């Protein structure tokens, strides 16, 4: 894995640094590493592919070394360099597509393809170069069991869970009470509704609560906390819990009284925020507890007093919402987010070559089913395949 990143880093630098007319002192330390790579890789044969429609390709390396005698690199040196680089780039492309496609339940952090099991010897250890990308740094730090952090912009930590809860209900569905939520991507939109608007609740206050457990512990998260959840604020008809009948929801929106957002780690309150909106911070957490309440307004104009009678027919239903959007967060485990394209590369390789469903990953690489049951073996497989995807995304655009 280290030598695969090293091959790709030298091929990236040798497409970048070895150009026409450049001075030799700019590339004097790269040509020695590329010659060490050629010297190491000669005499060895590899075999990539063999699963799904990924074709079996045989790789044989017989190349001459590059010259170390120019002052300015002329176009002859650039053309022979482009030939050797194009062959090695095709090789590492097929090794990365052979490694992202395989998985194992037993020990997923180990290389699974034959080519990367062959590259994991000490004969190939002199290929090794700097490990400067974030994924290979976290690979090398977790290979020695130290703390890592992946910085994500809007991480997909929440599985898709659009549902509700009726704390007070009946088959008439004309006096309901409870919460509704949308957990999607990095965004929680929650809305507790009461049809009576707390006309019989004690002190005209109805307490709502919504507890979101996470799968991995997020660290140093900037979170936009806004009131008035926008999706649960227009009238809609909703199927029941058993899916038998449908019930109508005509909301009018009160502001959330007494918002308490708590960030729990192992049941301990790490951060708490009482009636503070805008951008908040949560330093260390794996559970988000939103505690908002609906208070009936004690003074109402005649346009408002016709909405909430004391009797039964409520044509306008009180609804109170919050919105919580994790903008950026540092997570020790791998995830998906709106910035990288690594999950897209993994799914593109697994869908392009018509790959059968294996023992670990969900069918079709369903990220909702992958983050719903995010086991440590699946975590190891996901980190390995994302690291190889980062390597191929360095070489192949």
């Amino acid at each position: 894995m280290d030598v695969l990143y090293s091959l790709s880093k030298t091929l990236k630098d040798a497409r970048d640094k070895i150009v026409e007319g450049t001075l030799y002192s700019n590339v004097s330390d790269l040509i020695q590493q590329f010659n060490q790579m050629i010297i190491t890789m000669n005499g060895n044969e590899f075999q990539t592919g063999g699963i799904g429609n990924l074709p079996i390709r045989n790789w044989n390396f017989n190349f001459g070394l590059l010259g170390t005698t120019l002052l300015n690199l002329d176009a002859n040196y650039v053309e022979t360099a482009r030939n050797t680089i194009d062959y090695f780039v095709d090789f590492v492309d097929n090794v990365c597509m052979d490694e992202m496609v395989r998985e194992s339940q037993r020990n997923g952090i180990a290389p699974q393809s034959d080519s990367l099991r062959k590259l994991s010897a000490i004969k190939f250890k002199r290929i090794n170069f700097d490990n400067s990308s974030e994924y290979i740094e976290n690979w090398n730090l977790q290979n020695r069991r130290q703390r890592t952090g992946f910085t994500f912009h809007k991480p997909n930590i929440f599985p898709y869970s659009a549902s509700f809860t009726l704390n007070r209900s009946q088959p008439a569905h004309d006096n309901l009470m409870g919460t509704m939520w949308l957990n999607a991507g990095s965004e929680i939109q929650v809305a507790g509704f009461d049809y009576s608007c707390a006309i019989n609740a004690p002190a005209n206050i109805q307490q709502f609560e919504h507890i979101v457990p996470l799968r991995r512990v997020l660290t140093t998260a900037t979170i936009t906390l806004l009131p008035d959840a926008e999706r649960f604020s227009f009238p809609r008809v909703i199927n029941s819990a058993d899916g038998a009948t449908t019930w109508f929801f005509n909301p009018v929106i009160l502001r959330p009284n007494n918002v308490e957002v708590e960030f729990l780690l192992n049941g301990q309150i790490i951060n708490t925020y009482q009636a503070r909106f805008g951008t908040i911070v949560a330093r260390n957490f794996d559970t988000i507890r939103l505690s908002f309440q609906l208070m009936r307004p004690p003074n109402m104009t005649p346009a408002v007093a016709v909405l909430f009678p004391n009797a039964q027919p409520f044509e306008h239903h009180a609804t109170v919402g919050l919105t919580l959007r994790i903008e950026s967060a540092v997570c020790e485990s791998v995830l998906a987010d709106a910035s990288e394209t690594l999950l897209a590369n993994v799914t593109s390789v697994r869908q392009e070559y018509a790959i059968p469903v294996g023992p670990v990953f969900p069918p079709g690489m369903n990220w909702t089913d992958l983050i719903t049951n995010y086991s440590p073996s699946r975590e190891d497989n996901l980190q390995r395949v994302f690291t190889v995807a980062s390597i191929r995304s360095m070489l192949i655009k």
Binding site: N35, I39, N42, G43, G64, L65, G67, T68, T69
Partner: protein, 49 residues
């Protein structure tokens, strides 16, 4: 190419492919020893030059 190998002098490769026993074709214009002996054929004399 043996001429370019003579020019550069870094070797680096024929040393590698000679120590680790890798097949190779040295293109040059060398003079050769013609040799009529089966004992020298059994004794494997060409690897020693």
């Amino acid at each position: 190419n043996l001429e370019e190998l003579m020019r550069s002098g870094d070797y680096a490769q024929i040393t590698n492919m000679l120590l680790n026993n890798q097949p190779v074709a040295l293109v040059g214009a060398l003079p050769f020893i013609t040799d009529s002996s089966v004992i020298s054929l059994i004794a494997k004399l060409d690897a020693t030059v």
